Design a protein around this ligand. Sequence first.
Ligand SMILES: Cc1cc(N2CCNCC2)nc(C)n1
Length: 185
Amino acid sequence: HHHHHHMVHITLDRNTANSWLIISKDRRQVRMGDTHQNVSDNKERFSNYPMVLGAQRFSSGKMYWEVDVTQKEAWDLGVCRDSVQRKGQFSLSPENGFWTIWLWQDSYEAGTSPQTTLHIQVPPCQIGIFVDYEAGVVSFYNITDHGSLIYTFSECVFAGPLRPFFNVGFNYSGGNAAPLKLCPL
Ligand SMILES: Cc1cc(N2CCNCC2)nc(C)n1
């Protein structure tokens, strides 16, 4: 792919984070803490899952960024509507305003309803995410395997501004403590 030139500098929005997340001072990394991080509650925070949004909002254009997932056992990545539900239980699906892929239990899925099996021969250490707002496209690339395509959501109905979306995943196993990191341009 030749999407690298639409690169955007993404930073994480502390105010949207689940209360157990630790966002770095540069707002480029996030990890699961072992306890509540001593923040006040607010209506923006994801309550049920270790989720956070990027600060940037996109309503036009082509955007590309990369995320480091090295040594993680579980995570979700993609984009979502600015108006997604924050509280309680919900599915990551386009009907609920999410365009995402996951790792869980040694398999990769796309967040369709129902979910779609992904075919990845080289487990990725970095994921590239491409959004074409006007075309209604969200695509995922395997940076570890020369940029190979992972998955394309097409005919997307965004229906609002989009935000970068992250889930660091739970760490019940003690093997999923590693952070998500936004990779340099
Ligand atoms: C990586 C991951 C897993 C997950 N589930 C929750 C329901 N049971 C199956 C596992 N949910 C999310 C949002 N992310």
